[PDB]
Structures are given as C-alpha cells and as structure tokens.
Ligand binder design. Structure first.
Ligand SMILES: Nc1nc2c(ncn2[C@@H]2O[C@H](CO)[C@@H](O)[C@H]2OP(=O)(O)O)c(=O)[nH]1
Lengths: 96, 96
C-alpha cells in the first residue's frame, strides 16, 4: 500500500534534484538510475513489468548510493518516494 | 552544486601559484597536497573515488593551512576553488 502523500517541500532537498533530472531524462549520476523497478513485494499497485523505474536520491555523507529513491510510474505525476530502500513509499505532492 | 565559473585573474594570486604547482607535479608546500578529496557532502558532481584531489591555496599570514583549496577533477581544465573549506565551490577559468 502507499503510505499516503508527502509534500515535496518536506523531503530532503536532493529529492527535488532527482525529480528535475527525471524531467530532463538526465544525465543521471549513477549508471543504475533509470532501471526498471520490479515491485517484487507488491507494495505499489501491480502493473506490467517495465511500468515502474527507479532513480537515486543522493544522501549526502553516505558512502554508498544509500536507501533513498524515487520510483516513477507512467501516469502523470506518479512519483513515489522511499527513504528506506523500498520498504515504504509515499506519493509525492509537488504542489506543497 | 557549483556556484558558477570565475576567472583565474579574479581569484587570489595564491590560486595561480597552486595551479602552477599542479602543472609541474610539485613540489608542494604541504604534505596534504594531492590527497584524494572524497566529495563526501556531494557538493561536486558524483564521481568515482580518486577522481578529485585537493591542494592548498596558501592564505597569507596564516599559521595553519586555512580554508582555501583547489580541487582538481580528472577532466581537462576541471579545477574548483573553495575559500570556505568545502562549503562552496566555483569552477576556475584559466583563460581569463
Ligand atoms: N569536508 C570534507 N573534508 C574532506 C573531504 N575529503 C577529504 N577531506 C578532509 O578530511 C578531513 C576530515 O576527515 C577534512 O578536514 C578535510 O581535510 P583538509 O582540510 O585536509 O582538506 C570531503 O569530501 N569533505
């Protein structure tokens, strides 16, 4: 299930950076940016393979790509944030 | 993010000195000169470990290494100046 909506202004600032890169189709910092998200645990609505894609939200100070991601779906403004490596997701509201 | 491009001639004269030392591969005045800059804070673009190196820009009168540095990247002409110990950076333009 999606755990509700979150305002974009409330997320780490790097979430805005990632959304801007998604809007321009990159260039992205990581080679794994833009791979298909398989939704293996069915936390997001079930869709055909390839509907969802994932992108890194950089965590400053982290030595890895970290645990923050944006997952896009195909619908307009269908962008989900996870801060916990795909355990929970929130729909991003870009208007607040 | 990088805060713009600045002409070399607009920087303190010591920045010119450090660039000339980098071009000759030293010798450098400080032992820390040439160590890897981690980009831990993700202020500069994401790159592999060892892409960036740090060099002192001497601050006149200081007893310590102070807060001024040049960070090189591996690309041609890719050099960043900070006067505030890595809080902000500007790209150096050696052509002006
Ligand atoms: N802030 C910061 N310091 C760095 C980085 N890479 C190397 N350093 C050095 O690591 C020290 C802290 O562990 C910092 O004081 C800085 O020392 P310098 O002043 O020698 O550059 C980096 O990515 N960020």
């Amino acid at each position: 299930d999606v755990s509700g909506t979150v305002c974009l202004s409330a997320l780490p600032p790097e979430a805005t950076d990632t959304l801007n890169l998604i809007a321009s189709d990159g260039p992205f910092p990581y080679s794994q940016d833009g791979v298909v998200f398989q939704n293996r645990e069915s936390v997001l609505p079930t869709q055909s393979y390839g509907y969802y894609h994932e992108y890194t939200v950089i965590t400053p100070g982290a030595r890895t790509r970290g645990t923050r991601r944006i997952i896009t779906g195909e619908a307009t403004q269908e962008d989900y944030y996870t801060g916990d490596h795909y355990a929970t997701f929130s729909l991003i509201d870009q208007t607040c």
